Amino acid sequence: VYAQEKQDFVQHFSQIVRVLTEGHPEIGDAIARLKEVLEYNAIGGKYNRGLTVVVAFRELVEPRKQDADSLQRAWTVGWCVELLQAFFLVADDIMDSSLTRRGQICWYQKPGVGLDAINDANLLEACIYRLLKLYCREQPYYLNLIELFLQSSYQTEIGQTLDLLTAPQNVDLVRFTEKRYKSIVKYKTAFYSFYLPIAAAMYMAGIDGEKEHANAKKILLEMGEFFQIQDDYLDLFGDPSVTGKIGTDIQDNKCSWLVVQCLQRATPEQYQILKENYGQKEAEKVARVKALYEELDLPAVFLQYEEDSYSHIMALIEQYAAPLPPAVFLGLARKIYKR
Amino acid sequence: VYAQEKQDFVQHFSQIVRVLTEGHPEIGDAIARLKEVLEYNAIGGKYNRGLTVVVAFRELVEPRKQDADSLQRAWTVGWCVELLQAFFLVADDIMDSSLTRRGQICWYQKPGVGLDAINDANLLEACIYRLLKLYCREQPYYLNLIELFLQSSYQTEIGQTLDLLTAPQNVDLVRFTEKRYKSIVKYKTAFYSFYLPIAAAMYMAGIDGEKEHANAKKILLEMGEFFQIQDDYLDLFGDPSVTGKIGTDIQDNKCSWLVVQCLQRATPEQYQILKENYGQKEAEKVARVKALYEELDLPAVFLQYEEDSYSHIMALIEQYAAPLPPAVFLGLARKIYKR
Ligand SMILES: Cc1ccc(-c2cc3c(N[C@@H](Cc4ccccc4)C(=O)NP(=O)(O)O)ncnc3s2)cc1
Ligand SMILES: Cc1ccc(-c2cc3c(N[C@@H](Cc4ccccc4)C(=O)NP(=O)(O)O)ncnc3s2)cc1
Ligand SMILES: Cc1ccc(-c2cc3c(N[C@@H](Cc4ccccc4)C(=O)NP(=O)(O)O)ncnc3s2)cc1
Ligand SMILES: Cc1ccc(-c2cc3c(N[C@@H](Cc4ccccc4)C(=O)NP(=O)(O)O)ncnc3s2)cc1
Structure with a gap:
């Protein structure tokens, strides 16, 4: 394709x-x-x-x-x-x-x-x-496309505002909740990365119904959540000679899916190890975080999440793809979920 | 009004x-x-x-x-x-x-x-x-308004790009030509300050014709040129306790109508006085510019321009206001041309 x-x-x-x-x-x-x-x-x-x-x-x-x-x-x-x-x-x-x-x-x-x-x-x-x-x-879809790009702009901007409020590159973790992580990703990246391009094709094809679009969105935003969570994982565990990226989420105080999970799981003691080292650029202080995530078997938590995520997507696709060809959605899931 | x-x-x-x-x-x-x-x-x-x-x-x-x-x-x-x-x-x-x-x-x-x-x-x-x-x-004018705001955005952005290229706040005057001054003002301020609001009213009123809009634009952009030129004059000669503004066009290396004129008129000697002092913040070096403009009777050149400008506008209005009530345009000229 x-x-x-x-x-x-x-x-x-x-x-x-x-x-x-x-x-x-x-x-x-x-x-x-x-x-x-x-x-x-x-x-x-x-x-x-x-x-x-x-x-x-x-x-x-x-x-x-x-x-x-x-x-x-x-x-x-x-x-x-x-x-x-x-x-x-x-x-x-x-x-x-x-x-x-x-x-x-x-x-x-x-x-x-x-x-x-x-x-x-x-x-x-x-x-x-x-x-x-x-x-x-x-x-005939001219106005539909304008509205979609403008709306895709707005949600992304909102997501950006939301992230900026969440992560002042200054040290804080209580605002790094899963509810909030999920919100940031939906508004900031998913909407325009996954929904916007399919939607644009849809409008271009005469498929303008609110229902259809709601359905496609439902699949696409959940795909988009996964994409980002994987991005967060690979920022730190991605072999960098595959990726091309070398990661700096921990140095940049990001609200990464990793840290979010780390915080859900940590003893009150380990919160400390993280309060002390997240955001610093000292390699030692960057290592002592990676090494904590590793101690908390988060690479396993990811695998676990990727499996469930893979089912949920296929379920969503089975349920909401119609009457679009499932291949529209599978063509994307292919680009994301390597075995 | x-x-x-x-x-x-x-x-x-x-x-x-x-x-x-x-x-x-x-x-x-x-x-x-x-x-x-x-x-x-x-x-x-x-x-x-x-x-x-x-x-x-x-x-x-x-x-x-x-x-x-x-x-x-x-x-x-x-x-x-x-x-x-x-x-x-x-x-x-x-x-x-x-x-x-x-x-x-x-x-x-x-x-x-x-x-x-x-x-x-x-x-x-x-x-x-x-x-x-x-x-x-x-x-029914929904799309017309979107297109107008988007286009008003684009021209302003273009004008901004044009100004940024013209005036790197680094010392240069050969790029400060009248052709270029005029271009900057048309794209950067006139379009959105004068054309956009009347146009929006027009569309709101059912008046969508290209002809009508071309006519209104022709009046409005020339009004907009004046507005800006007056702004440039008053940046330096405006009594600041009327204005509210205290001016810094000379310190900020702006492509002001003043400097443009100053450059059209200066001996090769006086170009020097200006090459040396424009853009500096030393009050002495800011004074020696104002004092040059004054030596070149530019406040008179302005008055001269404001008179002609006032005729041209009324002419434009006589010629292109129809079939809009001239009062639309006069209501603005009133806000601009004090006696
Ligand atoms: C941790 C983890 C667990 C299961 C998976 C699964 C991936 C996958 C899968 N992935 C496709 C990609 C894919 C996904 C969805 C639709 C089509 C194709 C794949 O990796 N193909 P390849 O030839 O490169 O091995 N296709 C069918 N079933 C499964 S189950 C991925 C990661
Ligand atoms: C809508 C959309 C936006 C970005 C993507 C990206 C996919 C991708 C990407 N995907 C890999 C697959 C992949 C799988 C697992 C981990 C990393 C990369 C891929 O394109 N494989 P394919 O064989 O089809 O060319 N790799 C590196 N950067 C990106 S950015 C996909 C869909
Ligand atoms: C340098 C200079 C020379 C002539 C003028 C003129 C302004 C003007 C003028 N101005 C109106 C403003 C105006 C302009 C256009 C239409 C209506 C009203 C004005 O100043 N009224 P105010 O009661 O405050 O003295 N109205 C009629 N003729 C003229 S000629 C302004 C500045
Ligand atoms: C489209 C449009 C945009 C900005 C203006 C502005 C007019 C203006 C302004 N005009 C003065 C008139 C004026 C005349 C000469 C020199 C300075 C000010 C005014 O509004 N007089 P009015 O009696 O109607 O309230 N004074 C200070 N700031 C601004 S900004 C007008 C029209």
């Missing part, structure tokens, strides 16, 4: 840019900057979210209604998801004071960008809507 | 907030933060942009079609303009490293906000669209 169309998708970017950078010579300079912004930040991910739109649109539309223009539009809206992602990242890395991203210098950290990245992020967001105007204003 | 409805408008804010902060207990914390963001940043301006929507809607709709619900919606969309303004300011003050705004500490500069303001700004933007959903999704 995905490896099979990643070429046409990543190749269409050029067009996405050509159009977004074309009557008005006076502003050409700013447009030059926009090009640069898009080239640095929309590129270099694995493109799974955007791609999900394309793949799903193939699965959902009767192939008789998949002309060149229709596909073009699915590529375009797929790139709209990747631009939403890019907008959030650029802005999130400023906020976290991150150094790298996708293995390069964060955009804001480049010489002579700095906090100008704030506006660059805002343009990334704007390009979504330009693109929808240009490719979709005549389509 | 304006003093006459500023009460109902500023009073409606409470409702705007009540609604934007109301099913979902898990996120209530973030909503609390949102409330705070809106209270600090949507409040304390003079509300001229928002108000323009309300006043214009009164002028444009047959009074038989101005029920309670219609008004409610004009207040709401007026507040949407003020939220757009708030979103841009919060983000612009981070970018400039400003200290104050509307006579208080900039939001980002408050203890324990910082660059979290980036997300706070993004929520300000989001609230626009929530508000439009809640009050206007059933109206």
Whole structure:
């Protein structure tokens, strides 16, 4: 499904840019900057979210209604998801004071960008809507897509606010509850990473019903919870030469699924070991946390969670996939649940 | 027109907030933060942009079609303009490293906000669209308003990019040309400050024609150019006990209308006096610029510009106001051109 169309998708970017950078010579300079912004930040991910739109649109539309223009539009809206992602990242890395991203210098950290990245992020967001105007204003789902991107923006922003309130990078754990962890993930990542791209395909295919969308959302948000929990696990236990990432959740005082669990289980004594070491950057003090999680057999708790999670998803799919082809959902679960 | 409805408008804010902060207990914390963001940043301006929507809607709709619900919606969309303004300011003050705004500490500069303001700004933007959903999704102009706010966002962002490229707060004047000054003002401030609110009233009143809108835009953008040029003049020559502002365009290396003119007129010698002193914060070095502008009789050049500008506007109004009541436009020119 995905490896099979990643070429046409990543190749269409050029067009996405050509159009977004074309009557008005006076502003050409700013447009030059926009090009640069898009080239640095929309590129270099694995493109799974955007791609999900394309793949799903193939699965959902009767192939008789998949002309060149229709596909073009699915590529375009797929790139709209990747631009939403890019907008959030650029802005999130400023906020976290991150150094790298996708293995390069964060955009804001480049010489002579700095906090100008704030506006660059805002343009990334704007390009979504330009693109929808240009490719979709005549389509019957035009407004549905706008509302979905705008709503996907809002929930992510809310989730971000929620995380910022939860984890002031300053030492506190009583606010790291499972209720709250789950909330953060739903609003901050799941909605836009899992629901938004399938939903966009759905609208593109004429499937606009609230019921259908509620059903698909129910599956997708639970998939999204898992995805993140696995991300949290692998931040620390992922072989880094598989992953590509080397993890810093413990140094960055994150509200990781791990710590949440660790806190549910710890003696009042061990809370101390964690109160003392979480957030510090001393390797010794980072080791004494990993080593605590390990003492609490949390890698086992994960495996245990991944199994249940895998059933729940299949159950959800059995129950709510209809009348969409289960393959829409399985195509994603495949990308997540390795054996 | 304006003093006459500023009460109902500023009073409606409470409702705007009540609604934007109301099913979902898990996120209530973030909503609390949102409330705070809106209270600090949507409040304390003079509300001229928002108000323009309300006043214009009164002028444009047959009074038989101005029920309670219609008004409610004009207040709401007026507040949407003020939220757009708030979103841009919060983000612009981070970018400039400003200290104050509307006579208080900039939001980002408050203890324990910082660059979290980036997300706070993004929520300000989001609230626009929530508000439009809640009050206007059933109206026939719903999509027109979304497109207008989104487009107003994009042009402002472009203008911001353009300004950032023009004025790196690092010393340069060859890029401060009149063509470029004019471009910056059109994209960065005029469009959203002058065109957007009248346009929103227009759409609200059933007047959606491209022609009408082109006409209104033509008047409004030229009004907007003046407004800004006057702002630039008064930044330096405004009696500060009238204004409320004390100006720092020269210290901040801005691409002010003043400097632009100064550069058009200066001997190759005087370019030097300006190359040496513009952007410095030394009062002596700030004085030696003001004193140069004064030596070049620029306060006279302004008066000269304000006169011509005043004719051009009236001409534009005579020519393009129809079939809107000229009073829509005069109501604004009144707020700008004191004798
Ligand atoms: C800890 C743990 C326990 C069980 C699993 C299971 C994964 C899995 C599974 N995973 C697929 C991925 C998958 C998932 C869902 C639908 C389709 C495909 C897989 O790993 N295929 P591969 O050829 O690479 O070994 N497919 C069918 N049953 C199961 S049970 C994964 C992790
Ligand atoms: C909607 C959506 C968003 C992100 C993803 C990502 C999947 C993924 C990823 N998944 C692996 C699978 C995987 C399984 C277990 C642990 C890590 C990685 C994968 O794509 N395998 P495939 O053989 O299909 O190319 N690996 C590294 N980064 C990412 S980011 C998937 C779906
Ligand atoms: C430098 C300079 C030269 C001429 C003017 C003019 C302002 C003006 C003008 N201004 C109105 C404001 C105005 C503008 C446009 C339409 C209506 C009202 C005004 O100042 N009224 P006020 O009672 O406070 O003295 N009205 C009619 N003709 C003119 S000519 C302003 C500044
Ligand atoms: C669309 C729009 C946006 C901002 C304005 C502003 C007008 C204004 C403003 N205008 C003065 C007039 C003015 C004239 C000349 C110099 C300064 C101020 C005014 O409102 N007079 P009014 O008697 O109607 O209350 N003074 C201080 N700040 C601002 S911000 C007007 C219209």
